Structure formats: structure tokens, C-alpha cells
Design a protein around this nucleic acid. Structure first.
Ligand code: SF4
Ligand SMILES: [Zn+2]
Lengths: 216, 105, 249, 66, 251
DNA sequence: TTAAGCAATTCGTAATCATGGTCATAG
DNA sequence: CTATGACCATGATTACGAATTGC
């Protein structure tokens, strides 16, 4: 954030984030000469990339989505087309845009609150009445569909434990609570999402019954 | 850059933040970020102080670690030895290497 | 293997022109109870729910529960290569991702198209059944003209259901206006009321909802406290078609 | 009230009952009672004359993304 | 307190549909003689005089010589929201600067009640001369619109020759010259060229397309001209009054 | 009262132009 | 009910202004 008049002369993203104060604190904000960090969230105002910028801690505590198409075509794509072309021809632009094309077809994500009360078939994604995990046409193949995804729960369990005990060694103590919300540590907010991945993947396997009793 | 100054006659001031911001071109200039880059590492505090005395002892150990880190950075980065050699080769005082540019020399 | 045959292809063309503007991709849940569909719109605001029951298909055969992924634009382009009197049969394998449509003229000319499907990773949502307290049954033409006529003034509309009738009001920079309707076969406006209602909804969604007007003569509007307004149509011994829209706060 | 909100804030930071910022308040009160360290019979007698209020029946930092 | 009714009310839709493409505003002079409108054009070539007598209405209460101003095209966009069988009612308070339109239905089940706000006006106003018009022609309006539109695809401005036996509508264009001749026909489809002395004049055919926007507005169209004067086209608004469009001639 | 200098590649952001698509009118 | 014309927007391309690095 440099001198304020050159950034008066033309609208930028970081200047817009800095000059927009917060409701919590109009006494801690970027000044002249420092660096402003931001990420770009997804919206439908395509004329302006200065209308989609947000503080990293604010998108942390308020959980706004990310514009994967912005990061795909505006951040990544053109440096790669600088580097990868001179070794080959223009079939190399088509090779990386086709290596995108085999891999672009896999995406993951008022009225939106009135959902749930049923879940889609784990095999073929068909919404249906009742809580059972398998579909009646894909009911036979179920031992393989249980086998699949318990090796995913197994790998999320292994990632929870390596992270939440690293904070205990970076903190010093093994007997008291961790309080470190250090925004420059990758440890923070990577220890926050595995709790939710595990929360979700544990509940998907309770679609299947229990492997035994527990009150004996 | 726009800074305040406070007057002390006889004594010399060396904020390590200004030395980093003048010499080095980095990505973040927080104490955590430069302590990781060189070495390798408000509302909660108000209830660690309105509590008991072992909480206040924990607060004091945290504050003493904070007050110790810039000494280690000053002696490890060879700051002061290079400032003394710069003042001996150029012939300007030791307060001008934190306030001025490359014209007075 | 799936194979259906239906004599009135016009019903199929009306339902496919209900949806080709609001939706771009869908998944058909083919079952042994019929052909059922749920989807959200592209704007993530409104819900569609379409049911074609199994009986009304005059030759049905479904072996196993399927799920087909259809681009609705290409299908809407295919179903306009079929005149309004033809007899439509659908042919699908249980191992394939390509659908067959055969149109049979009622006179020397038969036509057959193959369309490539797509695999999609969508999630299916639904609705719970509660009793909406304001129940309107009104002519569809009047509702289409009322929405289209209030549309030029401003973009919101307030629905005001009172005892004898309902009253729609709308404002804008060139002024405001309302339209009344009162209790008095299908040109009547039957109004059941327990608690009065007043709510606000945007007009672009309503002018999307009134695109499927040739499917029936009357339209059913259901309201309650703070729930999404329901617009409901019935298709004769085939099933129904419902849109869902949430009120403004 | 306003004196009952400092007794609970004092029970929450005494180190001789446990390291408690992940669980409820009454669970930690019963955990110490099982081991019988010395729970006092006043941090119980305000968790009974209230319903499920989130500013009595919750730890101090039950916000705060730690 | 102005409060007036019109049962066969499609005529108001019909006049403002032929009003809004010409001019953007109107000076509505409500007198006890009824509803009147003298207004110039925007290009300083033409003029509209609308007269609506009270005896062409149904039910009437006029207590004020109101002199208001209407932005026409927004009023036309509001008038597009009512059918043609529907009854048109106007209400006006002499202190409340708004127009309250009430559209009744012929089956009375759909009620409309619209409101358009007012804006101030200081419009210019000139008087028409009264004189002798050397050629007055009674014509079908649809045939007249058909003929001038048939001439619109040749050129831009029309030359007219008005004489005893026939009348001569000629024009040039980028494809050459053309002209159509008419004669009297020996009640709505009857024509008559009443003539004293033959003349020749120049007029703008595009303003004839603008004037034929009132094609469904009467039984017959009247075309009144003389030497070097504004052509007055007349659409006799049946049982109501009349609309006269003046066009100052060309040089 | 004090300040090291300039050349830029380069990419982003904004504005303008072109092209089609949709809606409304008129025949 | 279709066909034609007009309007409106939307998308793409080109030109200019700005953080960092090469000297
Ligand atoms: S979050 Fe990162 S910086 Fe903070 S204690 Fe854990 S490992 Fe250390
Ligand atoms: Zn299945």
C-alpha cells in the first residue's frame, strides 16, 4: 500500500480492502508503506476483481467460498504457457489444455437451508427416500463399496494426530491448552479443516450399521 | 515511510523492524515470519490477567520470550558490527544510518 | 434395460420447454415407480420437482433403477424435431451412457435419434410436507398477464391474501398498482384461507415460473408464514410439476 | 447475575481441576468429582437454577478458532 | 374534483399509441368542455389538437379548469396493462398532483388502479389559422396508410398534385420516379376529393407515416390542404370529438 | 528538513466495439 | 403466427497504468 494519490488515480483490490474498515476495529488497519494480504472469493460481479477481495482471517471465521476459475485461468494458466511451450510446439498448449480437459471434468462444490433428511446413493448418486446407503440396483456390490472409503477414513485419522500434537511441541507444554492463532503458520487453519473432514467422513460410515453391540 | 521519533539525548535507538524494512525484501514483516525465515518457529490476555497468578506467570514468560527474540536477531545477523564498520568507512555518525539516505555519506 | 412408450409427445415437449431456460444440467432418476426429478436452478434460489407416474406411460418397462445425466439444451433441440401428434418411445441400456428416442408419426415416416449422456456429481434435495394456510386456485392466463404487466413498473411484488380474495400490489418509478380477486368452473378463483398472508417476491423468478402455461388451465398457489411460496401444476393422469421460491426478509 | 459470571470464570482457570477448553462446564465439574479432587458446591448450584444458556453452560473460549 | 368515465375505452389506448412516437410530452387542458390537448411537435414542423367533448363521455364531474402535463410514453406503458374492452376511468384532485387511473373489467372481476405522478410544464402555445382549404379529401384510413407506406419504399419526401379529376401522389427515389393516381368513386369506403382550384405542394412522407399511426382511429380519414399552409389530417373520434394533426408545409 | 538514479518487461484492469440473441411489433 | 427489426447486453481484445526487478 504505497502513496495514497496514485492509488486514488485507479481502482485496485488491496486499496479497496484496506480502506474498507471493519466493524470490529477501526483502529487497526493497514497504513502507508506496509503489505496487505487478501484472497479472492467467488461472486457474479465479473467487471471487477476489486469487488471480490477479502481478509484471510475474515474468510476464515465467516467461511466464504473460493473462485477456482479465477485461480485457474488468471493465476496459474499463463505462467505455465510461458514455460512449457518452447520445448515443443503449439500441440503442447493443447497438451496441457487437454491434461486440463481430462481433469477439468471433476469438480467439487435462502432455499439452501431447507435441505437434508435423506442422502444420495453411494454407488450411482441417485436421490431417494430412506436412509440406507446403497441403491437397490447397486445393492449387490456393497462389500467393495464399504471397502472403499474406509481407507479414506483411515488416512484422515492419521492426519488428525500428526497435526494436533505438533502444536504441543511448538508450544512447549504437554499438560495445558494450545492458544496460537498465528496467521503466518500453515499449522493454524490446516488443523481446523481436518476436524470437519473427519466429522463428515465418520458420519458417512454410520449409514452402514454398527459392527457389533456396545451395551454388553 | 512515516514514523514518529522520541527524544533521548546520549542514548541510541535501534528498532530492528526499521533495519529489516530497509535492508531486506521479504513477503511478510511480522516477528513470527522473520523468526521462521531466519531461525525457525489481545482479548485472551485480558482474561489471563483478570484470573490467577499462575496465568500471570504464563503471561510473563511469554512476554520475556518476546523481549528476548530481537537480541538474538541483532547478534546473529551481524547488524551492529556492520553498522560500526559503515560509520568508520564513510565518516558519518551512528544515528545517521537509521534516518538518512546515501547522499550525506 | 429401460423402454417407455407414450402416445402424447406434446406433453413431453411442453415439460421440456418448461425448463430449458432455468436449468442447464439434470439427472433423471429412472425407477420402477415412474420418472421423477428434483433440481435447483443455476442461481441457487428456486427448486423444481417433476413427477411422471408409471401408469400414464402406455407401455412401460424398467428392469433396474437408473440415473441418467442429461444436458437439457441438446435434448430441447432434439424434441423440436418431432411434430405435435407423434408417439414417442425412449430406449436405454443398463450398461450405456447414450439414449435413443424414436418418434412415430400417426400416418410412412419414423425417426430415431441417439444422444450422448454425461456423468455428473450433483446432490439431490427435497421438501418436507406441511400445510400451507392460503390456498389459491386461479386461471393461468390471468396470472401470466398479472406478472407480465406488473413487471414493467418495478421488480418486487407483494401478495396480499385476505378473506374474500387476494390482492397483488407492485410499485416502481412510474408509480404503483394493485389487482384484486374475489370469491364467486375453471375460470373461477377458489380461495381457502385460515390465516391472512402478505409477502414479497421478485418478478424475474415469477416470469420464469409462468413459462409452462400450456400444460394446464388452472394453477395452484400455496402460501404460509415465512415459507417458500409453492407454485403447482397438474398434468392429466401423468403427474405434476412444482416450483418453489423463498420470500424476501 | 454479574457476580455469578465471575465465579464460573474463576472455576474455569484453576489448574487443579484440569486443562479444560474442549468440553462443557458440567462435564469438567463431574470429572473432578469422580476423582474427587475438591469441586466446590457453588459452581454446581448455579448450573441447576438455569436452563441451557450458552453463557453459563460453556467454556470461556467456546468461540475462538483454537 | 375531476372524475370521468369511458366505457368503450379502447380509444384512449388508440390515441396514445399514435401520440408517443411523435412527441414526448403533452399539455392536457381539462375544461368544462372536456379534455383538450394543443401541443407542438419536437422538430418544429407539426402539431396535435385533441378535442374530447363532454357529450362523448358517459359520466362527468369537472369542477376546475385543470391545466396539467403528462409524460406520454410512461403513461402509454401503463396503458399497455389494460385490455380494450376494459372501462377507463380517470380521477384527479386539484391539490394532489397525480393521476389515478381505474381500469374496470367488462366482467368486473379484475380491477386495476394505477397512479402516475406529475411534472411541471411551461409549454409553448400557438394558434392555428382558420381559412379555406382548397382540397378536402375523405378517404379510408387503411387504404391511405397502405398507399403512403407503399410510397415509403421509394423515397423520403412526397409531392402532391390536387386537381379535379384525379389526385396525384408522386415521389422520386434512389430507384427512380413513381406516382399513383386516385379519383372519386361513384359511407366509410367512399372517397371524395372536394376541390375548387388545383394545387401542388411538397410534404414529408415520414410525417405521413407518423400521422397514419392513427389508422384505426376513425371511420374515415380527412385530408385538408390549401396553398402553403399546414396540412390538417383529421381522424373523427366517433361520437366523442376529433383529433387533428397539423403539418406546417415545406419549402 | 530530507531523497540514491532510470529502463522496463509484463501483466492486469478498464473501456470500447462488435456480434449475436431475444423480444416485440406488424402484417 | 410467423418474420423482421431494434435494442441490449455480454464478451473479447487492445491499450494504458502500476509492483518489482535489471542495470
Ligand atoms: S498453529 Fe502452527 S504456529 Fe501455532 S502452535 Fe501450532 S504449529 Fe505452532
Ligand atoms: Zn445406486
Amino acid at each position: 500500500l504505497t502513496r495514497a494519490a496514485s492509488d486514488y488515480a485507479g481502482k485496485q483490490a488491496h486499496v479497496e480492502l484496506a480502506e474498507r474498515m471493519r466493524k470490529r476495529d477501526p483502529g487497526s488497519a493497514p497504513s502507508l508503506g506496509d503489505r496487505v494480504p487478501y484472497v479472492i472469493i467467488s461472486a457474479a460481479k465479473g467487471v471487477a476483481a476489486y469487488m471480490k477481495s477479502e481478509d484471510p482471517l475474515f474468510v476464515l471465521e465467516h467461511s466464504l467460498p473460493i473462485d477456482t476459475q479465477y485461480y485457474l485461468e488468471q493465476q496459474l494458466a499463463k505462467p505455465l504457457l510461458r514455460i512449457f511451450e518452447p520445448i515443443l510446439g503449439e500441440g503442447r498448449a493443447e497438451a496441457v489444455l487437454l491434461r486440463g480437459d481430462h481433469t477439468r471434468c471433476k469438480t467439487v462444490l435462502g432455499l439452501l437451508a431447507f435441505a437434508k433428511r435423506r442422502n444420495c446413493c453411494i454407488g450411482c448418486r441417485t436421490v431417494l427416500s430412506h436412509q440406507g446407503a446403497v441403491c437397490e440396483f447397486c445393492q449387490p456390490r456393497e462389500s467393495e463399496l464399504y471397502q472403499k472409503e474406509v481407507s479414506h477414513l483411515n488416512a484422515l485419522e492419521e492426519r488428525f494426530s500428526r497435526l494436533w500434537t505438533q502444536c504441543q511441541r511448538c508450544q512447549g507444554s504437554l499438560h495445558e491448552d494450545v492458544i496460537c492463532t498465528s496467521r503466518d503458520c500453515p499449522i493454524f487453519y490446516m488443523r481446523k479443516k481436518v476436524r470437519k473432514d473427519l466429522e463428515d467422513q465418520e458420519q458417512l460410515l454410520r449409514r452402514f450399521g454398527p459392527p457389533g453391540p456396545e451395551a454388553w | 515511510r512515516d514514523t514518529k521519533v522520541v527524544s533521548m539525548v546520549g542514548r541510541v535507538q535501534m528498532d530492528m523492524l526499521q533495519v529489516l524494512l530497509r535492508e531486506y525484501k521479504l513477503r511478510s514483516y511480522t516477528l513470527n515470519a522473520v523468526s521462521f525465515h531466519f531461525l525457525g518457529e489481545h482479548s485472551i490476555i485480558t482474561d489471563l490477567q483478570n484470573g490467577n497468578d499462575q496465568t500471570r506467570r504464563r503471561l510473563a514468560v511469554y512476554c520475556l520470550k518476546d523481549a528476548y527474540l530481537p537480541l538474538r536477531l541483532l547478534e546473529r545477523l551481524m547488524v551492529l558490527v556492520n553498522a560500526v564498520e559503515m560509520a568508520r568507512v564513510t565518516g558519518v555518525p551512528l544515528s545517521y544510518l537509521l534516518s538518512r539516505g546515501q547522499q550525506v555519506k | 434395460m429401460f423402454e417407455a412408450r407414450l402416445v402424447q409427445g406434446s406433453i413431453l415437449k411442453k415439460v421440456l420447454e418448461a425448463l430449458k431456460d432455468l436449468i442447464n444440467e439434470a439427472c433423471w432418476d429412472i425407477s420402477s415407480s415412474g420418472v421423477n426429478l428434483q433440481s435447483m436452478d443455476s442461481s441457487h434460489v428456486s427448486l423444481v420437482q417433476l413427477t411422471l407416474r408409471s401408469e400414464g406411460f402406455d407401455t412401460y418397462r424398467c428392469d433396474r433403477n437408473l440415473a441418467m445425466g442429461v444436458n437439457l439444451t441438446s435434448m430441447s433441440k432434439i424434441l423440436k424435431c418431432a411434430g405435435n401428434e407423434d408417439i414417442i418411445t425412449l430406449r436405454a441400456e443398463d450398461n450405456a451412457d447414450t439414449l435413443a428416442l424414436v418418434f412415430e408419426a400417426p400416418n410412412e415416416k419414423v425417426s430415431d435419434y441417439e444422444m450422448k449422456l454425461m456423468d455428473l456429481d450433483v446432490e439431490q434435495l427435497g421438501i418436507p410436507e406441511q400445510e400451507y394456510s392460503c390456498v389459491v386456485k386461479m386461471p393461468s392466463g390471468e396470472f401470466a398477464r398479472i406478472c407480465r404487466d406488473l413487471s414493467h413498473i418495478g421488480d418486487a411484488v407483494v401478495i396480499s391474501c385476505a378473506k374474500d380474495g387476494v390482492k397483488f400490489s407492485a410499485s416502481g418509478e412510474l408509480g404503483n398498482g394493485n389487482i384484486k380477486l374475489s370469491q364467486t368452473e375453471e375460470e373461477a378463483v377458489t380461495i381457502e384461507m385460515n390465516e391472512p398472508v402478505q409477502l414479497t417476491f421478485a418478478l424475474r423468478y415469477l416470469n420464469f415460473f409462468t413459462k409452462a402455461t400450456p400444460l394446464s388451465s388452472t394453477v395452484t398457489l400455496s402460501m404460509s408464514a415465512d415459507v417458500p411460496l409453492v407454485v403447482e401444476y397438474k398434468i392429466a393422469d401423468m403427474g405434476h410439476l412444482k416450483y418453489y421460491l423463498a420470500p424476501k426478509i | 447475575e454479574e457476580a455469578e459470571l465471575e465465579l464460573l470464570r474463576q472455576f474455569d482457570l484453576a489448574w487443579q481441576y484440569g486443562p479444560c477448553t474442549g468440553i462443557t462446564r458440567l462435564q469438567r465439574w463431574c470429572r473432578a468429582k469422580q476423582m474427587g479432587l475438591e469441586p466446590p458446591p457453588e459452581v454446581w448450584q448455579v448450573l441447576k437454577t438455569h436452563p441451557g444458556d450458552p453463557r453459563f453452560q460453556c467454556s470461556l473460549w467456546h468461540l475462538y478458532p483454537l
